[PDB]
Amino acid sequence: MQIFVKTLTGKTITLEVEPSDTIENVKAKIQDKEGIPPDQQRLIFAGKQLEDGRTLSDYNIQKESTLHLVLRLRGX
Amino acid sequence: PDNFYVGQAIGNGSCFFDSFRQSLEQQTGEQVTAEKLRNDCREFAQKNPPKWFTNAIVNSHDNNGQHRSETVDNYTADIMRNSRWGDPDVEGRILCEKYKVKLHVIENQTVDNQDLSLHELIDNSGSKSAGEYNKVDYDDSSTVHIINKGGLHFEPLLDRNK
């Protein structure tokens, strides 16, 4: 199924995922497309941070959902 | 969680290391200088570092779209400069391995006008987004705690009890 990921810079990424995909898998897919190491990524859906070790289905994320990608904060 | 407050870190580019240093001292009792922490990262980079580290420092992204990249050889001198900021996902992972601790980071970010405090748990193998199922242990002496309020500065998160 297809989901969307929106960055704070305004970029929309499309991903092909399955309901059983873990959040780790989704971040790896974003690494594959965007070069962003998973440890720099955080994913937000419906106002909540998605936890590694859980699946998209666990969060009721269905086709054509938009997740928000926000990255590690630097400082300093 | 309730007994933790935001402390203060030095106001130069070593604030990541200074925040780590203050929390490590309260949690594990070990007193380390910020400069020693930087040397810990220099030594890691000199001693045949793994592919995860080479790949991270050539692929640093941020929320502004600034891509940063440098070689391992240049990192070994750069990481000793106070101007070179420390990142939880690189320097934090290195220090977690060195000191056998986990690193809890709170990051304040805003999405669609909703302020969030994001919790992350870093250890020697990488970083995980934490919360309700991957819980931060606020009674673990081997977890250190820092916060980034989104103003390009790290502060330690300390236990008012100690």
Numbering used by the authors:
A (entry chain M): 1 to 76
B (entry chain A): 39 to 200
Q: What's in the article?
A:
By determining the ubiquitin‐bound structures of two examples, we demonstrate the novel strategies that have evolved to both thread an OTU fold and recognize a ubiquitin substrate. This work establishes the OTU fold as a common tool used by bacteria to manipulate host Ub signaling and provides insight into the origins and adaptations of the OTU fold across eukaryotes, bacteria, and viruses.
As anticipated, the Ub C‐terminus was found to be covalently linked to the wMelOTU catalytic Cys. Firstly, not only did Ub binding shift the His‐loop up into position that opens entry into the active site, but in doing so it aligned the catalytic triad to facilitate nucleophilic attack. The second major insight from the wMelOTU‐Ub structure is the mode of Ub binding, which is very distinct from anything observed in previous OTU studies. The two regions of missing density in the apo wMelOTU structure are ordered in the Ub‐bound complex as two β‐hairpins that wrap around the Ub, forming an embrace (and EV3C). The secondary β‐hairpin replaces what is typically a helical arm in other OTUs and contacts the Ub I36 hydrophobic patch with H99. Q147 from the primary β‐hairpin of wMelOTU forms a hydrogen bond to the carbonyl backbone of Ub L71, but also to the side chain of N101 from the secondary β‐hairpin as if to lock the embrace.
